[PDB]
Amino acid sequence: MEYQLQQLASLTLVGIKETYENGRQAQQHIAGFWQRCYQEGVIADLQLKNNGDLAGILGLCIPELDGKMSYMIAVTGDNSADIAKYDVITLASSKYMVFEAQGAVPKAVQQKMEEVHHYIHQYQANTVKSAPFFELYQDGDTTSEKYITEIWMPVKGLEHHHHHH
Ligand SMILES: CCNc1cc2oc3c/c(=[NH+]\CC)c(C)cc-3c(-c3ccccc3C(=O)OCC)c2cc1C
Ligand SMILES: c1ccc([P+](c2ccccc2)(c2ccccc2)c2ccccc2)cc1
C-alpha cells in the first residue's frame, strides 16, 4: 500500500461535531450529516473560514471516552470567536500516514478506508487509537473518477517498525 508520511503542527478546527452510539452503521448517519450540513448552508459558511492550514474540508472521526464515536465536519480556521455557533477543537500535533482514495465520493473513500483498515492492522504499536483520523476533501469535482480524497491516519514511532529495517 502506498502512503506519504506527513506531520502537522497543532491546529484549530471549526465546524460541527455530531456523536453516534455505534460508529458501525454510522455511515448512514454520516451521509445524512453531510447532507444536512450542505442543505443548511453550513458547508458554505465554513468554507469562508478556511485559512488553508489544510487545503480542504475535513471529516474527522473522533473517539469518545465512553465508547461512542463522533464525526466532525470542519475546516482549519483562525481561532477567532466562532464558538457562539460552531464547535471548535484543537487538533493536537501529530505525524500521519496519508493515503489517497481516487474515485467518486463516497464509494472510493469507503473502499480505500477498508483497505487502509486491513493494512494498518500490521502496525498496532504505531497507530494511535485515541487520536482523531480524518478524510480531507480538497477542491474538485467529487463525482469525478479522478477525484482524490486523502485519508490521514495518526502514527507514533513508525520509524521503529521492523518493516523499515
Ligand atoms: C467537498 C466534500 N464534499 C462531499 C463530501 C462527502 O463525504 C461523504 C462521506 C461519507 N462517509 C465517509 C467516507 C458518506 C457516506 C457520504 C459523503 C458525502 C455524501 C453525503 C450525503 C449524500 C451524498 C454524498 C456524496 O458523496 O455525493 C456525491 C459527491 C459527501 C458529499 C460531498 C458533497
Ligand atoms: C478502536 C477504534 C479505532 C481503531 P483504528 C484501527 C484499525 C485497524 C487496526 C488498528 C487500528 C480504525 C481505522 C480506520 C477505520 C476504523 C478504525 C485506528 C484509529 C486511529 C488511528 C489509527 C487506527 C481501532 C480501535
Give your account of this protein's structure.
By secondary structure, this protein is α+β, with helices and mostly antiparallel strands. It has a single domain (1-165), classed as Multidrug-efflux Transporter 1 Regulator Bmrr, Chain A (Alpha-Beta Barrel). It contains three helices and eight strands; from the N terminus they run ββααββββαββ.
Brief descriptors of the model:
165 residues; alpha+beta; Multidrug-efflux Transporter 1 Regulator Bmrr, Chain A; 8-stranded antiparallel sheet; binds tetraphenylphosphonium; unknown function; GyrI-like domatin
What would you say about this model in short?
By secondary structure, the chain is α+β, with helices and mostly antiparallel strands. Helices cover 20% and strands 35% of the residues.
Class computed from helices, strands and strand pairing: alpha+beta
Supply the CATH architecture: Alpha-Beta Barrel
For the biggest β-sheet, the strand order reads 1-6-8-7-3-4-2-5
How much helix, percentage-wise, in residues? Answer: 10-25%
List the bound ligands. rhodamine 6G, tetraphenylphosphonium
Largest sheet entry? 8 strands, antiparallel
Q: What is the gyration radius calculated from CA atoms?
A: 16 Å
Choose one word for the global shape: globular
Number of domains: 1
Assign the CATH superfamily.
Regulatory factor, effector binding domain
Number of strands: 8
Strand portion, in percent? 25-35%
Order of H and E elements: EEHHEEEEHEE
> At the third CATH level, what is the topology name?
Multidrug-efflux Transporter 1 Regulator Bmrr, Chain A
Number of helices: 3
